Amino acid sequence: EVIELNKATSGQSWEVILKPPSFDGVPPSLEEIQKKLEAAEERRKYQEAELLKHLAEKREHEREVIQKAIEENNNFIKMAKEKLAQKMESNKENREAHLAAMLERLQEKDKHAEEVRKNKELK
Amino acid sequence: MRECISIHVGQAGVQIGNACWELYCLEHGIQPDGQMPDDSFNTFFSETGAGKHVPRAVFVDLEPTVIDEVRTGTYRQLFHPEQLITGKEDAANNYARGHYTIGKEIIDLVLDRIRKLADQCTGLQGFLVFHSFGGGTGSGFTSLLMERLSVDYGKKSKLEFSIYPAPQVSTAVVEPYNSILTTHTTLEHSDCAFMVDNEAIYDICRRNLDIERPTYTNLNRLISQIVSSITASLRFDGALNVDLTEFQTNLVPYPRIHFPLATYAPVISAEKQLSVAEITNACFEPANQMVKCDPRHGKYMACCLLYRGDVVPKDVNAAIATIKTKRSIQFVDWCPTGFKVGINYQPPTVVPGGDLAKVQRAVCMLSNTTAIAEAWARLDHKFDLMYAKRAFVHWYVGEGMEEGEFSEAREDMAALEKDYEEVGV
Amino acid sequence: MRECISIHVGQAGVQIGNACWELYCLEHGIQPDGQMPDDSFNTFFSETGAGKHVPRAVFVDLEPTVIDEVRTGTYRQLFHPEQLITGKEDAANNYARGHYTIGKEIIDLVLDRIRKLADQCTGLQGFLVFHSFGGGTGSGFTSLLMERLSVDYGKKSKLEFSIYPAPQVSTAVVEPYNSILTTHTTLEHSDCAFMVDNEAIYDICRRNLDIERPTYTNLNRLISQIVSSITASLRFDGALNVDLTEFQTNLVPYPRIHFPLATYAPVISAEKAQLSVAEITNACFEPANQMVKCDPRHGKYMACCLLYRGDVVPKDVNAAIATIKTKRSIQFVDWCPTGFKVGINYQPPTVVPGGDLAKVQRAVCMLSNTTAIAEAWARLDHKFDLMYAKRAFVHWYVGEGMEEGEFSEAREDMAALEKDYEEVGVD
Amino acid sequence: MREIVHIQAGQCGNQIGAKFWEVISDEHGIDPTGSYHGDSDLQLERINVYYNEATGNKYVPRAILVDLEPGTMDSVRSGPFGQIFRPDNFVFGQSGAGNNWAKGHYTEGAELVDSVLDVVRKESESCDCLQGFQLTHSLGGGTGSGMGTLLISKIREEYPDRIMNTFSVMPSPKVSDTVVEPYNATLSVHQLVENTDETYCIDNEALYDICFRTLKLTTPTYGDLNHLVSATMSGVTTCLRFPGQLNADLRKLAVNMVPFPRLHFFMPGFAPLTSRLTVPELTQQMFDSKNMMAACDPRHGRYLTVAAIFRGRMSMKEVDEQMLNVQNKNSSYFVEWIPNNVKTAVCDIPPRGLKMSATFIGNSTAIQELFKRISEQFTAMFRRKAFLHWYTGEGMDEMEFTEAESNMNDLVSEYQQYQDATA
Amino acid sequence: MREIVHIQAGQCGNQIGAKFWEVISDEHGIDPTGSYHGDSDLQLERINVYYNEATGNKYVPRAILVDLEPGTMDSVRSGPFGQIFRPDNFVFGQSGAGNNWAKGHYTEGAELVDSVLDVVRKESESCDCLQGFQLTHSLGGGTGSGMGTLLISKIREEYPDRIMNTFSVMPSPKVSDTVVEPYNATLSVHQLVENTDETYCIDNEALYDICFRTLKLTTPTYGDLNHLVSATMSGVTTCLRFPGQLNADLRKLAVNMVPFPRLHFFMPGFAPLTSRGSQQYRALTVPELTQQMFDSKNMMAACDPRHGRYLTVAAIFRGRMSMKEVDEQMLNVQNKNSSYFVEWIPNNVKTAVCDIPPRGLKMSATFIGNSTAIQELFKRISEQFTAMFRRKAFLHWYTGEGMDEMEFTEAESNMNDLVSEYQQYQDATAD
Ligand SMILES: Nc1nc2c(ncn2[C@@H]2O[C@H](COP(=O)(O)OP(=O)(O)OP(=O)(O)O)[C@@H](O)[C@H]2O)c(=O)[nH]1
Ligand SMILES: Nc1nc2c(ncn2[C@@H]2O[C@H](COP(=O)(O)OP(=O)(O)OP(=O)(O)O)[C@@H](O)[C@H]2O)c(=O)[nH]1
Ligand SMILES: Nc1nc2c(ncn2[C@@H]2O[C@H](COP(=O)(O)OP(=O)(O)OP(=O)(O)O)[C@@H](O)[C@H]2O)c(=O)[nH]1
Ligand SMILES: Nc1nc2c(ncn2[C@@H]2O[C@H](COP(=O)(O)OP(=O)(O)O)[C@@H](O)[C@H]2O)c(=O)[nH]1
Ligand SMILES: CNc1nc2c(c(N3CC(=O)Nc4cc(OC)ccc43)n1)CCC2
Ligand SMILES: CNc1nc2c(c(N3CC(=O)Nc4cc(OC)ccc43)n1)CCC2
Ligand SMILES: [Mg+2]
């Protein structure tokens, strides 16, 4: 069964039917799009904001490392200074005490001498 | 008038566009300067005050070197700078970047250039949209554009020429993701989509043109012949498929199942005349389909035969008789078993010096068969393999896409598969 | 930039400084007046507007006889008089006098002169302090100096070139006391101390140089080559360079374990009528060529720093060191996956004319941190214990203000140091 | 997507960086005076990816040269192509990093890093479309390792949307420069996991082994190793620099090579191996451990993704045939859940001195072996706290050491997890 | 540490002091008029240790001459080199101490001591860097022993940070019949234990024994004895006076020689032994000098060194000879004789060589021992002390001047304590 359909200046068309059908009959707004694109942009920006927040926390750790080394140097200086002043003072006192004892023994001998000369006149 | 506006998105879409517009110019006698010594060609070409004929086309590719092909090519004087939209970085093979990041940035500009073309039309039929499944731009931006065209041109037809991926020639591992993402989002917004399997075209150029390693130019020149066959009666005063809505009338009884199988013949090597019956037999050989699938694993819903050149009806009906007797062409049962035949008298044309020979008569068969769901299944399997491990998903999510869009797109394809099965029983 | 300040303390420190600065001048072409007919000698020499190159150094001694010889010697114009600092009375072999009684009288002047040298540095690397363990100044004044440098300069690198005592050439019986006392107080203030053993230097001069009774000038000239090998990386632009920080990082695994062992080769008699890169490398692991008497085969290496000078290509060092890694007799600690640091400077070693050392095309100085150096600490600690059990001579230290508690505290610190060397050698 | 900013940091960084610029300047036809003298316009179509074009028709590498020590950059100026680099792109400190990651990453590097970033930013503003950053450096030393990872982090903070790409040289006791290489490398591996997008693992262990075993160089020198590195760096950058079927860029590289963000450490490979040739044979060195620049056996794991570059005149069909033939015979060594995970590009421009060459960029789970080797060396030192005081002296806590190695042992576990995963 | 201030007190002190100055003046090339007529600048490099440089290129001994008896300094003034001494440095009293320690220390000596301090202060204040003092004196008389120890005490009070060194002549019944010399010596030794840093024990018993037994002097005179003293004093002060590898001073001597404050009494020894004005027909060999130095016949204290142990030893070899060979023999004598050196003072023998020999000898060796055998000297004095004190013999000679018995008991207790701690260290083990 051939059914002519159309004829025109540059062609013609028809329908060839070999067997008829067994069964008769056949058995997002602009605002919605724009919101979805804007939501995806906000998720990008959030993700990027979170990246930069982690890198900024790393910067502050770096500052805290560098500061800590400066504090260790400063407290190394402060303890070295304290202990050296303590040693030098304790050593000074000690040496002065030894010298003062040596002279006090010598001066006791000196008074004994005057007692010897006195006993001589007494007799 | 019945103007159609062509939109080419991504590199594949732009380069196949180059091939088709060159072929249109050869068929209508339009020189590379836009000048020209049947007025149906005005559906695809406007005319300027200098008397030059300008394609009703928009090219969208965010890498300037691709668009530079158009503006420095042989037919560059055909095009005006407002037809060419480019950017800095492309979508980096990432659907999410094409759809969301690039898409939000360029969509209004792209629609503005389309609107400028549409304002020049008096009876705009709709849009022919050329793009890849696998490219980040071809997939991601095309789907955003299709949504927006549905909003902005609600009653207008939208046809796709879609490059279905072949790993042999693709350089992206993530193409199955992009193909499912863009199919899901575009599904409700396209009236008729002709898929072209790069693997199918590659095999045809190797087998029938004796080219060891076909170039993109090889593939694209063969693709242009198919597109030209499909658009011939829009650009000439033919009889079958004389406007865009007729494609859905003749091929798409069910809206979701809108993916016709194209078969083309003959493809003869230039460095090498077949009968109506021989080229008609070739339309029922799977080796000549534009998508790899087995029609015996499906039923037809619709079938049209588009003849070009020296074709006389007695010779066609003779060929159809001999096929029906020898072979079982199973239609669904709510559909008549039959063929709509059109002959366009304009002779098939080839690029001079190309690898396609000039033939006296050609034919393109457009059939809606449930068998094309095999192409969807191959894609869905590769999708599933990678998505089970969430491989590469973080590149899409990093661009603002929600992970659940993967699952939502993949469910849609499952439903598409069951829709095809239900229809085929 | 990158300056190092050298401080030479007491007789040993000053006389070795004489040998080193003399050698530096010949190595850089500087004449005894500081004038000279590669910029990196400026790390050790500042320069006046008259073109005079002045050592970044201070010489300190509590008695003037030794530094007077500098003030009237060949290089009397090399230094500014203010760099040569002497008192009147020395420490009489008594740490307590170097550190307290006598040293306190001159310490502020020395620190003032060092601060003026620091003021001339744009990137001060640190201090090299040259001293003996055994003398009263070398021990007691160096301790005071190091402590004062920590106060003024914080953790700024301080490294030492130290003369470990040898009875044959020493003239003090209290040297074990002075050694242990200065080691105790200096421990936490020094980053790295290169120890030299006078006995080892003596035995090398006799054996390798055919010298029956080596003089201080004989020993000092050999010690000068070792010092020059170490500082050459900072004074010359070579292929592989090692700066002060890199010495500390690559030789000191723990803060207290900071006494590398120097070795030098070749030591050839000048009168005798070229050793390969492999040969001089191998000689550095020979126990005879050590600059401290100890047996490395008795211990485990923790770090080897090899400093080459002269005609030496990196390939040949690589092949030489690859052989060393195969010798089972050279054992490294469990916890050291890689222990070699290599330096190559391309200026050959220079020898003083009229000296006993032969001129050679290439030479190497190895600094090795080995647990075997604990043996040298053991020898010193035992001599300390012998006398200290009887409190022999302790009254001379107590009379200058020290307490007996400092002796036992110092000796206990040395006992912990010996236990530390044992511990780092366990698997 | 055009310009790459190349940075080279520390001694290894500047030596292999200089060799890189040497080799690709020759391929693109650029002499040391920046003047082009080549024979083909394939050499200039994409030359702006790596070179700025100055006034006198001359090309200047988009290269920034960084060190805390002035020495090795002085020796690069004196080198063969020393005069091609912009003089104000030398950014050098004076006092060095002391072989200490903490010094390069914290105190010393901080003092120099803002000077480098100013030069980085002047180059980034003269870019039409900045692709991203390519850094060369060692992980075993102080400046390249410590200051390079500091540079990476600060660059990420200022250019969070640009790709970060490194050539990161891994240390080996077989050719070491400092005793603390295991600490320096482990602290840096933690930084690269977190902050780079693509890292080529250039393993000195494997370079030495290639020279000793295959090339018969009984005593390999850095020159010998760096001949392998410069051959590799040329090969992997091919598709960035020349027009071809694949016009690659650093973001497409990341998208297709990195299925999971932490797993971005590539095994490079090269054939033929040479000291200072058929298509099927070239294809087979993909699985040859003998041709890997990371000391790992690819047959010890599975390929997530692979990039192959074939260079020279040769049949692209024969290449595609052999590549597929190798994939199928070796199917057990590719993950099944990434279909079509090998992509091949061919480029007709051979490297100098070779007619044909092959280069492989593998994302292999066998890379865990490299990191296990570093981990074991880290642990042998760290369990005894050897040399630790030089790092704590810089203000570092001990916890940074334990965190860095547990992150690296996690990377190892993550690679093991996907090695065992099934479809 | 440059200048030494020398003081000589009493007859013995001024006699041995004068001989000291004649001998070292000849060694440094100074004639009796103070002019330098020597042939080597080695003689002048450290000549300031003992000499001040005066007006006419002159050198004046830094020497203070003290005696309660006026005639002893007339003897000095007319002795050879009597004119070399500064005239203002002669401090003379009117009456000697009658061999009475108490006169020297408490009465007559105390009236003259401030006049001595006048001179001592002017010499000491003119010093650029004062090492300290050396005192020559006998312990058995009254002036040298009593006023000598009084001087030490008084000088120590003003110069407590300077070294106090003394050359102390111990009495012997073989040389003097004065029965109270054990008393004067014991009272002196008490003072020396507490107020000197270094004391050379010059034992008249040893000097007589050497002269009688070795020099075959049937009747030795003080001139004979003093020849051995002056040779000893030249030798022990060699490293103070000449430039050498060891530039010694009095404090480095004390630090290295004195392990315990009280045990600072040295046993000197000399080789070769010679009589005065006697040609030496053949010099001696280095190993001869080395062994003979450690021989009891060559000790200036009447103690056998093999009866105790050396705490510390200083040896001075003088003349042209091999320093290799000298170290060789010194190491040998130490190793073969290891039992006579304490083990718990390591490396306790130190040797100097000086190429300038003393006059009349081509080679010489001088020995300074801190030996525990020195307790034999103090035990000898202690026994003589007790034999008189138990009888309280002659005590009124001392209580007549104001002393008490208890001061005798105390000094005897202190010397016997000294003997005990020598014995303690003689028996001490390193285990
Ligand atoms: N038939 C044909 N296919 C092509 C052509 N160019 C690319 N393709 C295919 O298209 C897919 C890649 O998609 P494209 O549209 O070219 O890429 P794109 O989206 O412009 O690029 P990106 O934004 O970087 O992702 C792959 O499957 C390619 O094989 C072409 O000219 N012809
Ligand atoms: N190598 C070498 N060692 C020396 C030299 N001079 C002295 N010594 C050694 O140093 C130790 C003695 O310490 P000195 O440096 O001479 O004494 P000092 O530091 O000047 O201290 P006092 O003189 O006690 O104030 C002994 O072990 C000597 O052998 C020298 O010139 N070279
Ligand atoms: N070796 C030596 N001993 C002497 C000499 N002169 C006196 N002696 C000894 O000195 C002790 C007697 O003391 P003197 O020095 O003569 O007496 P002093 O110190 O001058 O005191 P007085 O004469 O009592 O006022 C006795 O042991 C004498 O043997 C001498 O020249 N040489
Ligand atoms: N392949 C290669 N490795 C090197 C080179 N130079 C140094 N290295 C390695 O780099 C590490 C030492 O770090 P280095 O770059 O020299 O120190 P930095 O200047 O602190 O960055 C060790 O693993 C060395 O083996 C080189 O030229 N080539
Ligand atoms: C940067 N140089 C470079 N060279 C090459 C490639 C490559 N990429 C980028 C691209 O576009 N595709 C791709 C896909 C892929 O699948 C697993 C792997 C790698 C890449 N990049 C592929 C061949 C040589
Ligand atoms: C005063 N004349 C003198 N002569 C000499 C020495 C000496 N001293 C001083 C010194 O510096 N060291 C020393 C160490 C020592 O160990 C047991 C013993 C003695 C001294 N002093 C030693 C040699 C001759
Ligand atoms: Mg001294």
Provide a descriptive summary of the structure in words:
The complex is a heteropentamer, with one copy of chain A (123 residues), two copies of chain B and two copies of chain D. With 123 residues, chain A is an alpha+beta fold. Chain A has one domain (27-123). Chain A is 76% helix and 13% strand. In chain A, strands 1-2 form a two-stranded antiparallel sheet. In chain A, a hairpin with a 2-residue loop joins strand 1 (2-8) and strand 2 (11-19). The longest helix of chain A is centred in the middle third of the chain and has 93 residues, at 30-122. Chain A is rod-shaped. In chain B, 43% of the residues lie in helices and 17% in strands. Chain B has three domains: 3-251, Rossmann fold; 261-375, Tubulin/FtsZ, C-terminal domain (60s Ribosomal Protein L30, Chain: A), CATH 3.30.1330.20; 376-424, Orthogonal Bundle (Helix Hairpins). Chain B is of the alpha/beta class and 425 residues long. Chain D has 423 residues and is an alpha/beta fold. Chain D folds into three domains: 3-265, Tubulin/FtsZ, GTPase domain (Rossmann fold), CATH 3.40.50.1440; 266-367, 60s Ribosomal Protein L30, Chain: A (2-Layer Sandwich), CATH 3.30.1330; 368-420, Helix hairpin bin (Helix Hairpins). Helix content of chain D is 43%, strand content 17%. In chain D, the strands form two sheets. Chain D has a ten-stranded mixed sheet, with helices on both faces. Chain D has a two-stranded antiparallel sheet with strand order 2-3. The interface between A and B is large, with 37 and 46 residues. One guanosine-5'-triphosphate binds at residues 10-12, 15-16, 61, 90-93, 98, 132, 134-138, 163, 165, 169-170, 175, 198, 216, 219-220, 223 of chain B.
